[PDB]
Amino acid sequence: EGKLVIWINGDKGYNGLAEVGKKFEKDTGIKVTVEHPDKLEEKFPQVAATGDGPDIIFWAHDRFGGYAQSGLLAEITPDKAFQDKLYPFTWDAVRYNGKLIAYPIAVEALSLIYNKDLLPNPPKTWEEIPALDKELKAKGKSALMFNLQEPYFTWPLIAADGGYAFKYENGKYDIKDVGVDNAGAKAGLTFLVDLIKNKHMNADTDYSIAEAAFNKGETAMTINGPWAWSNIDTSKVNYGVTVLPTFKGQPSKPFVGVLSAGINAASPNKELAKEFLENYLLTDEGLEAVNKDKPLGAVALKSYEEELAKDPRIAATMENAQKGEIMPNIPQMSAFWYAVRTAVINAASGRQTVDAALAAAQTNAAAPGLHAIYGECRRLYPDQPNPLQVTAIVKYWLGGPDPLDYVSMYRNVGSPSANIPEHWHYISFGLSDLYGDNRVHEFTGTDGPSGFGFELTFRLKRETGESAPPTWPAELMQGLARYVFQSENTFCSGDHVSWHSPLDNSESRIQHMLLTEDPQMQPVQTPFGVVTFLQIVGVCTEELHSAQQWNGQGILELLRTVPIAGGPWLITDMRRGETIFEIDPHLQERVDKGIETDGSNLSGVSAKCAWDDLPIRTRQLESVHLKFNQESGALIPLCLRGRLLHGRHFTYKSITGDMAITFVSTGVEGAFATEEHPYAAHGPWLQILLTEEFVEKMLEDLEEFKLPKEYSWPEKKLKVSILPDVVFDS
Numbered sequence: 001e002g003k004l005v006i007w008i009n010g011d012k013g014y015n016g017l018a019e020v021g022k023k024f025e026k027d028t029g030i031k032v033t034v035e036h037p038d039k040l041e042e043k044f045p046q047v048a049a050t051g052d053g054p055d056i057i058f059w060a061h062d063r064f065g066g067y068a069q070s071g072l073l074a075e076i077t078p079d080k081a082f083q084d085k086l087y088p089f090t091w092d093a094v095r096y097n098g099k100l101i102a103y104p105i106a107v108e109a110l111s112l113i114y115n116k117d118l119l120p121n122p123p124k125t126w127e128e129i130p131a132l133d134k135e136l137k138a139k140g141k142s143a144l145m146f147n148l149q150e151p152y153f154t155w156p157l158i159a160a161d162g163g164y165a166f167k168y169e170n171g172k173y174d175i176k177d178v179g180v181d182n183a184g185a186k187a188g189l190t191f192l193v194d195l196i197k198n199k200h201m202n203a204d205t206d207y208s209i210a211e212a213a214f215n216k217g218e219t220a221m222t223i224n225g226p227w228a229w230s231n232i233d234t235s236k237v238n239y240g241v242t243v244l245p246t247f248k249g250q251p252s253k254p255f256v257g258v259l260s261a262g263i264n265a266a267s268p269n270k271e272l273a274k275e276f277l278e279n280y281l282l283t284d285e286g287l288e289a290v291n292k293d294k295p296l297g298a299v300a301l302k303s304y305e306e307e308l309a310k311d312p313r314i315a316a317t318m319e320n321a322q323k324g325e326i327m328p329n330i331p332q333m334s335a336f337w338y339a340v341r342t343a344v345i346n347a348a349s350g351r352q353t354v355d356a357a358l359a360a361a362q363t364n365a366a367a368p369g370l371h372a373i374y375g376e377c378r379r380l381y382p383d384q385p386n387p388l389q390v391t392a393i394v395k396y397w398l399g400g401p402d403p404l405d406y407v408s409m410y411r412n413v414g415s416p417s418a419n420i421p422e423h424w425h426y427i428s429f430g431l432s433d434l435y436g437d438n439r440v441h442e443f444t445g446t447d448g449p450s451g452f453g454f455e456l457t458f459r460l461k462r463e464t465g466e467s468a469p470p471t472w473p474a475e476l477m478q479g480l481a482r483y484v485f486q487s488e489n490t491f492c493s494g495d496h497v498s499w500h501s502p503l504d505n506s507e508s509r510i511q512h513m514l515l516t517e518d519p520q521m522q523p524v525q526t527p528f529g530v531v532t533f534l535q536i537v538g539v540c541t542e543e544l545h546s547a548q549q550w551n552g553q554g555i556l557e558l559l560r561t562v563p564i565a566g567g568p569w570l571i572t573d574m575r576r577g578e579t580i581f582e583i584d585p586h587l588q589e590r591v592d593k594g595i596e597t598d599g600s601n602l603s604g605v606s607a608k609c610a611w612d613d614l615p616i617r618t619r620q621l622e623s624v625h626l627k628f629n630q631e632s633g634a635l636i637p638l639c640l641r642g643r644l645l646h647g648r649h650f651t652y653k654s655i656t657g658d659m660a661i662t663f664v665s666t667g668v669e670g671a672f673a674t675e676e677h678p679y680a681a682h683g684p685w686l687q688i689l690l691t692e693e694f695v696e697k698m699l700e701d702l703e704e705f706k707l708p709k710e711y712s713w714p715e716k717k718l719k720v721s722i723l724p725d726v727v728f729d730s
Contacts, residue, residue: 003031004269004276007044008058012034012259014294020286032276033500034121042447048072048264055267056277057107060257067262068096080709082278090179090300090489093258094324095171102262103277106296109321110156110254111313112244114240116239118220126157126191126245133200136220145210146223148196148203148348151253151340153223156244156324158188158340159253166328173330174364175437180340181362184473188247189354193347195447203348214239223254226297241313244320251323258300258326328488330363331443334527335436338372339365353404354680358593369434369450370406372526377427380520383411390474396430402696403481404430404456407474412459414571419563423571424469426458428477431484433528443528450529454491457518458536472504480536491534493517494552496544503538508574510538514547516556519569538572541581549638550594551601558587600642604651606727607632611657611686621679624688625717626661629653633709633720636702639663640695656725658684666691679716688716 004024008014014034028514037043041063047053057067063096067073078100085089090104104250114122118141123129133143147153155163163185166173173724211228213219215235223244232239244252261281263273280286287304290296298317299305308314327333344363346352352360364371381387390407394400398482406429414420433441433451441451456477460469484491497513504510518533527554537559539547559566562580564573581588628636634651639650644665664687673680673687680687688713690698702712709720 002269003033004056004272005054005059006032006056007035007040007054008036009040010038010121011294012058012296015292016286016290016293017281019289020280021362023079023285024280026123027280030272031066036064045070045072046205048266053264053266053268055269055273056261056263058261058328060108060258061102061104061329062333064094064101064260064262065096066331067075068099068101068329068481069331069443072265073101074263075269076102076263076285077273078103079277085282085302086300087302087322089322089326092171093256093586096329098171100258101237103282104258104260104300105281106259107256107298107300107318107321108225108259109256109317109324110153110225111241111246111316111320112508113214113222113224113232113239115220115240116215116240122240122242123245124243126247129245130198130200142200142219143212144195144201144221145205145219146208147207148192148205149341149345151337151344154192154251154344154719155340156186156223156254157192157247159325160247160250161182161187162250164186164325166330168328173328174559175330175332178336178362178365178574178724180343180358180365185358186354189347191247192344193354196348202384203345206656225346229313235389239315243323243610252320253324254320255327256321256324259296264619272653280577301710317579326664331445331528332436334446335365336367338527367435369436369526369528369531370429370433372524373427373429373432373434373455373531376521376524377408377410384410388469390471392478401482402478403440403485404428404478405434405537406430407477409469409471409474411462419567419570420439421563421567421571421573422462422475423569424460424462424478426456426469427483428456428462429532431455431481432531433488433526436528441528445589446525446527446529449531450526450531452491453530454532454534456480456536457521457533458525459569459571461571461575464576470504473582476503476652477536489517493534494556496547496552498544502570502574504574506574507576509540509577509579510572510574511541512539513537514539514552514556514559515543516552516570536572536649537566537684538569538574540576542581545593546581549599549603550591550601551643554591554594554598562587568605594644595638598636599648602635602638602642603649604653604662605635606633606655607635607651608656609652609654609661610657610725611661612685613659613681620677621680621681623716624679624686625719627725628720629725630707637699640690640699644690644695645692648679660685662687670725 014036017034021034024030024032041059044057045051064073066296071103086104087339088109091100094102094104094449096099112122123132129143136143153266162182162390164179166175167177196203210222211231214222214237217233217237244254246252261277265271267273282301284304298314298321300336301310305318339361343357347354349356388409392402393401395405396403408427410425412423412425414422432455436443447506456475458473460473480497493516495515499512501511502508514537516532518535518536521533523530543555558568558580560568562583565576565580609632610627612625643650644663647665649668650663654660664673671680671687671689675689678689707720707722711718
């Protein structure tokens with residue numbers, strides 16, 4: 001609005017910012033409003049585009065990387081006079097792609113917390129701690145307790161001797177160069193595991209146990225961030241905060257994240273914001289104002305840190321902050337976090353060796369999505385670690401024709417007791433985000449769908465004495481997958497696919513597909529999003545038609561009741577010769593009611609038909625004669641009962657013509673047919689409006705008699721005929 005609006009999380013000191021907003025108002029006359037709405041990090045991309053976003057946004061740098069790739073943040077341009085007021089490394093935290101995208105405001109870092117009563121002189125090295133633990137154990141106490149389930153707290157030691165996630169040499173992160181496999185990480189984890197083996201620590205320890213312990217006076221030491229402190233103050237423990245122990249002569253690295261403020265690229269007032277950020281907020285007065293209201297922690301302005309630095313506590317956060325590394329901004333951080341955590345836990349529980357866990361972890365950070373899926377696959381099929389797998393040798397993102405990188409092929413023995421035949425279970429890989437580096441699918445985050453948000457599956461009844469699963473279903477999946485990408489049609493459980501081809505290139509009656517949720521596969525959380533599994537179900541042309549006329553869900557249920565045609569898990573039998581309706585005539589009945597009580601999903605059809613026609617004008621007619629093929633005539637009840645009685649339109653379009661006939665219900669909007677003038681036409685396009693009573697009467701009248709079939713009324717006539725449309729006499 002030419003005024004400055006700021007959105008920030010509910011915890012920090014906005015009133016101080018409001019005071020700075022008042023100070024802004026005094027010196028410049030511009031009103032500064034400060035609000036702190038919920039879930040802002042998610043909201044900013046959503047509203048930033050419209051223009052109702054804030055001019056300035058405050059948050060830890062880790063989000064900003066996402067914001068920067070989406071193009072929501074403006075480049076900031078501070079003079080050297082300014083960049084020198086702040087520490088060089090805080091600027092590093094705000095560089096993406098070599099550009100500066102925010103003013104660093106506050107830095108948070110983990111530190112070593114000790115009880116002054118128990119340990120007057122804290123250890124300067126980790127190697128001392130065992131003996132110290134032994135000493136503390138001597139008086140019924142333990143030395144150290146911290147979260148071993150989350151890598152944020154164990155990474156310093158893992159990072160201590162040379163380990164790293166990504167190295168940025170020019171402000172740009174090399175995503176290939178991962179450092180979870182080197183001697184250092186291995187050194188740290190063996191040491192952690194060794195600490196746990198010698199019962200100096202317990203793999204079970206969590207936030208609350210560690211916190212309860214220090215606050216109750218049960219344990220001697222901890223590692224934590226500023227937020228925890230408030231709770232220790234209430235505990236009245238006399239404690240000091242200092243630098244973390246060194247390992248093998250090198251500093252521990254605690255991830256340091258700096259609260260920063262960025263300027264919205266869609267803001268008119270970018271320069272006002274720059275003036276404000278550089279000359280008012282980043283001053284002793286603005287920061288002091290904010291500090292009194294709610295402490296920021298260790299600030300980024302050298303001058304101000306010195307004022308704050310007497311707090312032994314602040315000193316330690318900044319000592320640790322300088323000694324530690326800055327969090328990466330790329331989205332793959334999410335991938336790193338899942339890998340490590342599993343590695344640490346597995347190494348600590350004895351499930352895996354240190355070398356193997358970190359070796360496994362380095363690799364899993366590369367293609368997490370594939371693996372996460374492999375996880376779900378592993379839960380169902382522990383018996384089959386390696387299944388026959390079709391690989392696309394020419395990868396899609398290098399110009400390849402096949403978008404599914406892998407299709408795994410399993411043998412499911414089934415359950416005879418549940419009437420589930422033995423079958424082959426195909427799972428696809430590529431529709432979801434496997435790699436998460438933007439090679440095929442744009443990265444979206446943990447929230448929201450990974451890639452298209454699903455993978456395809458298929459269940460093919462095993463023929464007797466078949467040694468191996470056939471491969472044609474993979475080619476089918478590739479076909480569908482291409483459609484997904486090109487077609488950009490939504491795929492949800494219940495949707496149908498018109499193929500018109502043998503699914504397996506045989507003479508089978510199964511020539512179409514319906515889609516449903518996989519019976520036994522549960523969806524998964526991959527760092528790049530959520531993945532669900534859509535199973536393909538082979539159907540006959542008649543069954544597809546029923547699905548179109550009613551809905552997919554209903555026909556799926558019908559397929560579940562007839563075991564040969566699907567059963568509870570919907571196994572496709574290509575060899576199947578009968579439709580579900582030929583097997584049980586009463587199923588047709590269930591379909592008709594569904595159409596009655598649900599309406600029909602068919603908005604129109606392409607068929608042989610015509611009406612009497614003849615720079616364009618909307619004509620009105622008092623007489624109308626419609627002509628239909630037997631095939632289209634058959635749908636007239638559906639057109640009337642299914643749509644008009646539910647206030648829904650229906651459209652016939654001529655295969656051979658530009659003619660069209662749209663049956664219109666009352667309450668439809670946008671028709672040029674009125675109750676006053678029911679029959680009207682625009683060029684070859686005809687709309688006819690029918691009142692519900694008339695519709696009911698017509699329905700009674702239509703019901704075998706020899707073609708041609710003629711119906712007549714006091715205003716309109718109808719004919720059903722066959723080859724006349726196909727072949728004219730003139």
